């Protein structure tokens with residue numbers, strides 16, 4: 001019963017959170033460290049292989 | 051210089067000794083071959099895949 005009394009408020013909060021994580025995804029390049037970690041490990045394995 | 055290298059430390063560029071034209075060294079086509087078959091219990095047609 002609590003959803004329909006602040007629907008605009010929770011919609012605005014959802015939009016603000018979406019914008020916040022959109023900013024935070026490009027805020028730093030260290031937030032995806034697993035992906036470039038495994039990519040760098042594969043590239044270094046190939047580099048030491050050759 | 052007479053010959054160049056890369057991170058892989060392979061001969062990729064070389065200068066000719068007879069003239070002054072810089073060339074490249076690139077290996078030609080290579081790789082394992084693959085096959086496509088539906089099994090001998092159904093048919094015998096196969097498709098070679100490079």
Ligand SMILES: *[C@@H]1O[C@H](CO)[C@@H](O[C@@H]2O[C@H](CO)[C@@H](O)[C@H](O)[C@H]2NC(C)=O)[C@H](O)[C@H]1NC(C)=O
Nearest residue numbers: 051052053064065066067068069070071072073
């Ligand atoms: C080795 O001999 C060749 C002979 O062809 C020389 O090539 C000539 O170089 C001159 C230099 O300006 C050019 O004008 C000619 O057109 C070249 N000849 C041909 C057929 O293209 C070459 O320079 C010589 N290399 C050295 C180190 O003496």
